[PDB]
Structure 1
């Protein structure tokens, strides 16, 4: 029992879900969904489809290179079973997930800095550009307040 990643969008592939295609060079293409499988058959480009992790890593929407992203790799040389080593690995997995999530948040925050500045400049230009509508708003404010007063 192993969790696979979708060949198209890198989403997890759990047992029973999705479909596998075997090419004549013995390469398995595992797909999580009919959506991804039909995209593969139509030969669309996953690096151009915006909803895929391959695109998001290629375009820099999420951090792709970090020291937390190197712990998980296919192990082709086995190690003998050790109970305490299994326990240490299990603790480390949760710790690594926590640190990776913190760094992901920071990466998105750095990518989205400047947003408030852009919003304020846009709002200022709109307010400067509409003197008549603001006058209507002030008349509405004054009439509503006079109604409350009387």
Structure 2
């Protein structure tokens, strides 16, 4: 199984949920929830709304692009399998998540500046 990304919410989506549409252009389009699919059918861009991940992360309301968010990305070439190398993924992903946990809070606090 492979987790894909929705073009509307720009977030991962599990299989067997929402609705999936494939255009004649020979590529797949996914939607986490039926509301996203309906909005995409109406051509309503969410990237200008305060709630969507794309707007929040880029503007400052949420964590922006950072070195931590540079590993969960698809790759074009395969990797040689190794049982020992599997353990590295478990530790590496956990450490990356722990590192990121200390950056989202910092970004939110920076956004909160001036609330005093």
TM over 0.5: same fold? yes
**TM-aligned CA deviation for residue 59 of structure 1:** 2.1
Deviations 1:57-116 (A, max 9, x none): 2322122221101112112211111111110111110110010111111111122122xx
Equivalent pairs counted in the alignment come to: 116
State the 4+ residue runs in structure 1 displaced beyond 3 angstroms. Answer: none
Query: 1:15-26 residue pairs with structure 2 within 5 A?
Result: 15-26=15-26
**TM-aligned CA deviation for residue 51 of structure 1:** 2.0
Higher-Rg member (1/2):
1
Residues 68/91 of structure 1: CA separation in 2 closer, same or farther (3 Å cut): same
- Single out whichever of 75-84 and 52-61 deviates more from structure 2: 52-61
Query: TM-score, structure 2 length as denominator?
Result: 0.89
RMSD of Structure 2 on Structure 1 (CA): 5.4
Bigger fraction of residues in strand: 2
Structure 1 residue runs of 5 or longer lacking an equivalent are 115-148
Query: TM-score, structure 1 length as denominator?
Result: 0.71
Q: Partner of 1:91 in structure 2? A: 91
Greater relative contact order, per chain length (Cα 8 Å cut-off, separation 6+): 2
User: Whole-Å Cα distance in 1 between the matches of residues 103 and 83 of structure 2?
Assistant: 31
